[PDB]
Symmetry: C3
Subunit: 259 residues, 3 copies
């Protein structure tokens, strides 16, 4: 999808690409290591067994959708390794996972929402998946559009995220009462991350260089690195611990849900 | 995937991009509104089984039953993006109008999947990939500036001709199964399918990439009408067919003619 | 994704694109015909019935995942028809399935591994699918990267293929003892292809023009055409025959597996 490249003399001074590339690459490398390790731990813990007691699976293998958290974290860590390669190369490399904003997100966060929908048995999994997909593609279109019509694309995205976020939240409530207080605690701390950090991205768009111009692209990269540390890694760890508590309640102890 | 852009002085006069962009954008906006509303109604009606609105035993509809509305909403979102591109004068970096049939590789394969799920047609993956490859051959034909585009088109015609001849046969095998009311809705949906899907190959021949009889602006308008029919009207007919089938088999508990 | 094009005067003499394009196109056309015919035979044989006796399916149709071998072969044959179109056009065609190396592979070989995982009932099908996906995307990134960081991307790919290949192989062993000696023979000859030809691609990268410079891009295209003839077509035929033998053992004769 690439047409631009770093000029032979380097990025023009004062442009949005005139960033601290060693620092951005180091941040991306640290994020890659942390998120990939979190995904590896997620998959290893999933293969250990059900619940905190590590009860062996009857079929000998975990459910395939249960690997989504670790798979998404490992994919995000691989993309962050690629991002570190791009930043350490000075940016603007042909395979830049940093250039097109939210393009990487169209790969992780839809699946992430799918993982969420699978962990909480939320209805309309395909609907949520496609809502997230279209919101992220509207964001990509907004960030590649140089005219004012980018604010149209952003608005289009806000027309897909506002219902979805209001729908998911409602459904999450319907599931929250079902789970026991320990699984409820883990679910609460994960939903805090979800419904307090997913809205940040739309707000970050407004104050970015494509909006009011308060946040530079370098600061945007750092902020989104921290958000991916929270939205992928910490959220996936909270999902894994919630699943372990649920399996301990319902599979190891055989107790029923509050449904 | 984009390399071209609208020249600073505008599109060259007499080129295929020298179109009526306010008109194309208005048509795309109207199509966006209609298709998105049709998908919203499809999902709302799905969440309401059958005309009696019998509650689901699990409390939620089957996930594949949302495909019609999901596809219509995705097509409406793409038409909103198309209206943004046309109102910007075309050649916008995120142009869903530039690469022809590129948007279709997202909607119509899933659409065929939806069809295969509604009629319990065999070889759903086969049909999905046949549609996928036909549409990608069309994209390759439209981006190819040499005569080898007619090769790509031919390649697409090598994937659509069997598929359309296979699906039709399978549709016959399913048509006798359903009751006369579901048969009526299925007949009117299959009329749209087997009379409008062949139009695209014929439209290629007479387009600016063929004999040069249909301009790109007329192509955009014709395909907007086709997407109004192939996505929205077809999805409404599928939703009504599913409602009639659910009324026959779930609300009344009657068996199919199988 | 394309920015480059064949110069009006033709490819510069001595460049990596200064290849024998009629020969490459003829090879691609022959590969297209063979792989597409192999996929057509795979689907026809699958529709014939279960096993060598062609026992009719109880539901009247084959399992949908059983069509993966033929579907992948037909998709690869279609991409080879497109490759022949590109080569006969002189290369550098806007829709070039030859330009970006391993970009076509991100479509076939992940699904292929999925097919394998479905035929052998291997655990962690999503994990294997995403491992292959990320390995191939790392290869694409390495081949589009003009700096030394391509060897980073390659290394990243080697960080995803080395565990996966070591994991799959282990799981394959766990399945190998399950199947009868005839299915074991077909599985052995397919695993020979897998574990002796998949490692070739990483080795071919090192000696390619992007590495030590021993293998030209034309030779690379010919070698990968032969590999796709083996890794898609011959491997799919071996999978089809293994499935027929398994169906004859377990469905036609009703005999149990050695599990
Ligand atoms: C509404 C909206 C947006 C939404 C972004 C979201 C919801 C991003 C989530 C990212 C995550 C969860 C990343 C984790 O790895 C954009 C693209 C800013 C702009 C267009 C409209
Ligand atoms: C055979 C063939 C074609 C087929 C097109 C079809 C079958 C399109 C269907 C579109 C739909 C149903 C859109 C709805 O939103 C092309 C691409 C014209 C050209 C190459 C060969
Ligand atoms: C490890 C590695 C690679 C692996 C390639 C493989 C494993 C390719 C398989 C291809 C097949 C099976 C094709 C069949 O149609 C690359 C991309 C060379 C380079 C980066 C790292
Ligand atoms: K799960
Ligand atoms: K996991
Ligand atoms: K990332
Ligand atoms: K990018
Ligand atoms: K980015
Ligand atoms: K950028
Ligand atoms: K995760
Ligand atoms: K997660
Ligand atoms: K359905
Ligand atoms: K629907
Ligand atoms: K559209
Ligand atoms: K397009
Ligand atoms: K178009
Ligand atoms: K165009
Ligand atoms: K539809
Ligand atoms: K439909
Ligand atoms: K199979
Ligand atoms: K097959
Ligand atoms: K190929
Ligand atoms: K390519
Ligand atoms: K290639
Ligand atoms: K090339
Ligand atoms: K195959
Ligand atoms: K195969």
């Amino acid at each position: 999808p690439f047409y631009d490249s770093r000029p032979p003399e380097g990025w023009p001074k004062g442009s949005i690409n005139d960033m601290d590339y060693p620092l951005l690459g180091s941040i991306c490398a640290v994020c890659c290591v942390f998120v990939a390790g979190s995904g590896i731990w997620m998959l290893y813990r999933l293969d250990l067994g059900m619940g905190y007691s590590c009860k062996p699976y009857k079929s000998g293998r975990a459910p395939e959708v249960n690997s989504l958290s670790g798979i998404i974290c490992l994919l995000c860590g691989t993309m962050y390794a690629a991002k570190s390669f791009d930043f350490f190369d000075g940016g603007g490399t042909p395979f830049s996972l940093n250039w097109y904003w939210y393009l990487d997100y169209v790969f992780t966060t839809p699946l992430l929402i799918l993982d969420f929908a699978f962990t909480l048995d939320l209805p309309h999994k395909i609907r949520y998946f496609f809502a997230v997909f279209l919101t992220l593609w509207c964001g990509v279109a907004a960030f590649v559009t140089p005219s004012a019509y980018r604010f149209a694309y952003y608005a289009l995205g806000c027309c897909w995220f506002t219902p979805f976020a209001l729908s998911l939240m409602r459904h999450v409530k319907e599931r929250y009462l079902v789970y026991p207080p320990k699984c409820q605690r883990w679910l609460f701390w994960a939903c805090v991350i979800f419904f307090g950090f997913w809205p940040m991205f739309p707000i970050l768009f407004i104050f970015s260089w494509l909006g009011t111009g308060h946040i530079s692209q370098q600061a945007f990269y750092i902020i989104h690195a921290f958000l991916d540390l929270t939205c992928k890694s910490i959220f996936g760890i909270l999902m894994t611990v919630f699943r372990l508590e649920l399996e301990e309640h319902t599979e190891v102890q055989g107790l029923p849900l509050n449904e």
